[PDB]
Design a protein around this ligand. Structure first.
Ligand SMILES: NC(=O)c1ccc[n+]([C@@H]2O[C@H](COP(=O)([O-])OP(=O)([O-])OC[C@H]3O[C@@H](n4cnc5c(N)[nH+]cnc54)[C@H](O)[C@@H]3O)[C@@H](O)[C@H]2O)c1
Ligand SMILES: NC(=O)c1ccc[n+]([C@@H]2O[C@H](COP(=O)([O-])OP(=O)([O-])OC[C@H]3O[C@@H](n4cnc5c(N)[nH+]cnc54)[C@H](O)[C@@H]3O)[C@@H](O)[C@H]2O)c1
Ligand SMILES: OCc1c(F)c(F)c(F)c(F)c1F
Ligand SMILES: OCc1c(F)c(F)c(F)c(F)c1F
Ligand SMILES: [Zn+2]
Ligand SMILES: [Zn+2]
Ligand SMILES: [Zn+2]
Ligand SMILES: [Zn+2]
Lengths: 374, 374
């Protein structure tokens, strides 16, 4: 009896950069063909959502952000075959259309239907399902999870285990999967190796988790906030270092600590300088460095290509290299079987209505993940 | 006998940048412990040797350059076990000590004993075996092949098949092995893939050979000198393109040609701009780009890390990723077994005394490899 009808509900609308979200009523159109309307249950605050506020990440405004979430299907449009009303689902900010050259490639996951490279802030059909104050409001990465209801394309949603705890498994929608996959799938961390992880937020902790799962012998956590070190050790960091404590640049420090460079390094911050430092600190002949952090819009880094010529490998990835729709249900199943833990990432819980407090907690350095409940 | 005695012989000395080689008499000391003195038979002219002349590469002068060569052992120092007087050998400009962390690593080949990173222009012991007009002359990459006799450390020489034609297999000492290994070992080019090769000199042609050998379906040769195209097609290029023919940047052209980007790209020139263009032209989600060219000293490139975040892999390598002492004898054996051709790389064969004329041929665009015969 809400099926086929416009739903009025509360969402967190971002009208302008560098402003608080406005929690207010929006209108959510019913799903069109191959679309799915989802009642949100839990959503995490990822630093990439903050990047939209700060203008680090440029996407059309006004917008309903949010991309790390889980909820329950309210209704499905014509021709949907992969979810049903009442199913538990995770929106996929990286789609999996299953048809494009990337989806068909054994390794690739950055599906060509993504809204990340050149954001339009729309559904796949170039239109919006959201109205607020009578004005159209942009989507974000096809997900727009900061709303009591959202509409996503079918290629941007995965059915998950019906017994899943949504307030935990929402993290599988971005931070955990990204960090863990960056280590196990993208870098392919090896048993006995030495790893360095730059940035010990939600995603960097997940990288550490993945490095420890892959059997790394030494895992160096690097952060300018020493308050982040205790938790990093808890999830597998063997040593933590704060660049501020040292006279030498940290790439030199880490090279010394690793007797000539690390096997695998990860940038999980989003700064051009730490992307280069992270590359430099991996062993010059065989080291691998993975960029996970999101850089500031349109800015280029400068580097000496001799860092590569010696034999380093440099790569980046979205969503841990996981093919999203294939991978998310499996990751949930694995979580339900206790193959990895999510609680170490969750430091704060708040109602959706306190979204701004949640962002304050992230910006202050106090939280890892705050989970918002609808 | 010459063993244990200084040899007076002819070498090509480079007294200063941007001048002709001086062909004149030098004194070559006998080998010390773990050293090998080699009578040179044939040496190729590699663009890297030109970079020493041009100042693109910085290495101490005065110098005896040359690193792509083959000869016959004249004498050995105490303690040498891997070669004997009379053996055919190839000097190894990337050593293989067998003891360092890189030599012990299954993938790495940039042995920590190399003289490339921080060139000293000496023997492993920090001294020189060469004098000319009473002045010490530096070595180059532990090899110094532009001389009738050179002295190399044992870790910088490999014994090869006694029946090898030295005037051909000298190419295994640099250009062939570098290009071929860059394709087959570093990129790990796959069957049915699309490849783009920037630069169609000796090394880029060898990259093409490797891509074809690895079963690439399409191989795009890219050069501003259209005279290089015929030979590129002979060795496997399926299409050749000259960036100067197009109004659009060539990365865009190549992306269109490859219906969204290539599987593997190779920079085989040594320009910062083409390194970035080569990266960009590989498919954004799963593409791999390998830097082979040597860039001008101390210059940084500028790039947008979003090219990596989407999923690209960027890497570089020295000597095709090959562990040099293990690999060079096997490559020579494979050549003798007709597994690959070297003649397509050889455009000119000149006596050593015409070294300058050979560099002029390279610089004018007219040659691929000139082989100099002693
Ligand atoms: N590639 C992907 O798919 C993907 C997915 C998730 C998040 N991201 C990005 O990954 C980054 C981390 O996200 P997150 O974990 O939620 O963020 P976060 O919780 O802000 O963590 C970042 C950490 O970096 C630390 N830091 C800041 N500056 C420095 C410095 N100069 N040196 C060392 N440490 C420093 C900081 O103290 C904090 O603990 C952000 O840029 C995100 O946008 C990318
Ligand atoms: N990584 C290694 O171990 C290694 C080994 C051997 C050589 N190298 C380097 O690899 C590069 C190629 O060496 P080579 O094959 O002897 O040199 P080469 O024979 O001069 O070939 C270079 C080719 O690049 C072409 N070229 C120049 N500018 C451009 C441009 N803007 N766009 C397209 N094509 C262009 C040029 O026409 C020529 O055919 C040089 O920088 C060498 O120093 C590196
Ligand atoms: O945190 C995941 C995430 C990314 F990795 C991006 F590259 C991006 F543009 C974005 F909006 C985002 F949410
Ligand atoms: O051509 C091989 C070669 C290189 F790949 C270098 F990086 C270098 F510095 C050099 F001197 C050289 F000869
Ligand atoms: Zn797709
Ligand atoms: Zn995220
Ligand atoms: Zn070594
Ligand atoms: Zn060379």
């Amino acid at each position: 009896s809400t099926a086929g009808k416009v739903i009025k509900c509360k969402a967190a609308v971002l009208w302008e950069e560098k402003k608080p979200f406005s929690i207010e009523e929006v209108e959510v159109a019913p799903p069109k063909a191959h679309e799915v309307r989802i009642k949100m249950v839990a959503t995490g605050i990822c630093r990439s959502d903050d990047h939209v506020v700060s203008g680090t990440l440029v996407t059309p405004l006004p917008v309903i952000a949010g991309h790390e979430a889980a909820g329950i299907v309210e209704s499905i449009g014509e021709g949907v075959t992969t979810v049903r009303p009442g199913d538990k689902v995770i929106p996929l900010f990286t789609p999996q259309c299953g048809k494009c050259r990337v989806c068909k490639h054994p390794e690739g996951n950055f599906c060509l239907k993504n809204d990340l490279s050149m954001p339009r802030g729309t559904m796949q059909d170039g239109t919006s399902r959201f109205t607020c104050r009578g004005k159209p409001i942009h989507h974000f990465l096809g997900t727009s999870t900061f709303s009591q209801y959202t509409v996503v394309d079918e290629i941007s949603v995965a059915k998950i285990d019906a017994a899943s705890p949504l307030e935990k498994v929402c993290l599988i929608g971005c931070g955990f999967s990204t960090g863990y996959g960056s280590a196990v799938k993208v870098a392919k961390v090896t048993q006995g190796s030495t790893c360095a992880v730059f940035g010990l937020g939600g995603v960097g902790l997940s990288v550490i988790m993945g490095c420890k799962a892959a059997g790394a012998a030494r895992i160096f956590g690097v952060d300018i906030n020493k308050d982040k070190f205790a938790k990093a050790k808890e999830v597998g960091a063997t040593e933590c270092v704060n660049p501020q404590d040292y006279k030498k640049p940290i790439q030199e420090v880490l090279t010394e600590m690793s007797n000539g460079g690390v096997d695998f390094s990860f940038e999980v911050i989003g700064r051009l300088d730490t992307m280069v430092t992270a590359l430099s600190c991996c062993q010059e002949a065989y080291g691998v460095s993975v960029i996970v952090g999101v850089p500031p819009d349109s800015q280029n880094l400068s580097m000496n290509p001799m860092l590569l010529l010696s034999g380093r490998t440099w790569k980046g990835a979205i969503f841990g290299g996981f093919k999203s729709k294939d991978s998310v249900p499996k990751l949930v199943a694995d979580f339900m079987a206790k193959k990895f833990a999510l609680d170490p990432l969750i430091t704060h819980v708040l109602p959706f209505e306190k979204i701004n407090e949640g962002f304050d907690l992230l910006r202050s350095g106090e939280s890892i993940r705050t989970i918002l409940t609808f």
